[PDB]
Structures are given as C-alpha cells and as structure tokens.
Design a protein around this ligand. Structure first.
Ligand code: RET
Length: 226
C-alpha cells in the first residue's frame, strides 16, 4: 500500500502495452535491418515491464540508512536501466553506422553510470552518496557528448531521412536523460526534498517517454529500412 504504487501500476501498464504493440508490428515486418531495430527496441520496454511489475509487487525495494534515517531505495530501477540504456544507445549507434569502438566505449560508459549510480544509491554515508552521484553523472555527460557531437557527425553521411530521424531521437534522449540525475539529486536517493510518490511519477514519465516514446518515433520511421 505504498503511495507510489499507483505510478508503478501505470508504468507497468504503459510498458506492457508498448511491448506488445512493438512485438506485433515487429513480427509482421520482413526486412532484415528493420527486424534488428525491432528486436532491440521491443526488448527495452520488455525489461522495463518486468521490473516495474516486480516493484509493483514489492520487490527491488530496500532500506538504506543515511542522514539518521531509514530510507526506501528502489534498486530494481538499476537492473532495468543497466540493460535498457545500452540497448537504447545501440539503437542510435546502428542508425548512424557508428564505429565498433565507439559503441564499446559508450556501453562501457553506460555500465559505469548505472553501476556507480547504484553504489551511490546504497551508500550509507550521506556525503559519499553524492560522490558516486557525481561520477555517474560525469559518465552520463560523456555519453551525451558523444551522441551530440560524435553521432551527429556520423549521421551527416547518411541519407537525409536517416539523419532527420536520428536528430529527433538524439534530442529526445538528451532532454530526458539529463533529467534523471537531477531527479535522483532532489529525490529519495539524494536530498530527500521530493517525496518518493512524486519521484516515482517523475521517473515513470521519463522512463515511458524514453522507452515507448523513443520506440514509437524510431519504429514508425523509414530510417530503419535496409
Ligand atoms: C529507460 C531508462 C532510461 C533511458 C534511463 C536513463 C537513466 C539515466 C540517464 C540515469 C542517470 C543517473 C545519473 C546521471 C546519476 C545518478 C543515478 C542515475 C542512475 C539515476
């Protein structure tokens, strides 16, 4: 009966619907290249759907003590993000033909961001929580710098239609991702200013927008076509 459950139920529903819709459209398409984008992009909200469900049912939540209090931390989010954020990057990476080393570096950075974020989430010394938060956000910025400067340049060599689709997704990604560290900062994991219920709502709106929103834009485009 935690108050944030209503948002966990809506994120479950939205992610589940989104998965089904993408699966249905995906299995209908025969183009090889398009099927690859569909397979990657249907997996993302799939993973998110299972995690939101678990949390809705009481899993992935633990009490961490810091600030002289017992604080409720949803660690199931990091298990979701660990695998969905690199898959989203792969989507963007395939669109622009990015180099294999570039992708290895991104995913690597991404592993670090999610890994330090979680360590930071679980840290019992208040001050140190933000030390882990800082590194994680530093890793995040590296990724955004690459997608904005690096990937946009590679996109330049693709047809206009492919480059156009990437810019939209690149913008969607940049705007949504940069909002996660601030939410963590002022929410349950950080300053404890925004309450967990509201925080769950914020992450749900970002999550769904970043997965199903991102998906709808990518999968409805001509750009995934070989
Ligand atoms: C579907 C989920 C997506 C697209 C999640 C993106 C998540 C981020 C960009 C998260 C970033 C974080 C930081 C920069 C620092 C503190 C902890 C995190 C993990 C909340």
């Amino acid at each position: 009966g935690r108050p944030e459950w209503i948002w966990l139920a809506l994120g479950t529903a939205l992610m589940g619907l989104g998965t089904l819709y993408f699966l249905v459209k995906g299995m209908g398409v025969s183009d090889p290249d398009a099927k690859k984008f569909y397979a990657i992009t249907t997996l993302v909200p799939a993973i998110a759907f299972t995690m939101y469900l678990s949390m809705l049912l009481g899993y992935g939540l633990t009490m961490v003590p810091f600030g002289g209090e017992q604080n409720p931390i949803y660690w199931a989010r990091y298990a979701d993000w660990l695998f969905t954020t690199p898959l989203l990057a792969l989507d963007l990476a395939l669109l622009v033909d990015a180099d294999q080393g570039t992708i290895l570096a991104l995913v690597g950075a991404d592993g670090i961001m999610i890994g330090t974020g979680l360590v930071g989430a679980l840290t019992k010394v208040y001050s140190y929580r933000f030390v882990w938060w800082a590194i994680s956000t530093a890793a995040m910025l590296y990724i955004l710098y690459v997608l904005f400067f690096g990937f946009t340049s590679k996109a330049e060599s693709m047809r206009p239609e492919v480059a156009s689709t990437f810019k939209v997704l690149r913008n969607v990604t940049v705007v949504l991702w940069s909002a996660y560290p601030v939410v963590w900062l002022i929410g349950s994991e950080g300053a404890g200013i925004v309450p967990l219920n509201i925080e769950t709502l914020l992450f749900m709106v970002l999550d769904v927008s970043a997965k199903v929103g991102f998906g709808l834009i990518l999968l409805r485009s001509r750009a995934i076509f070989g």
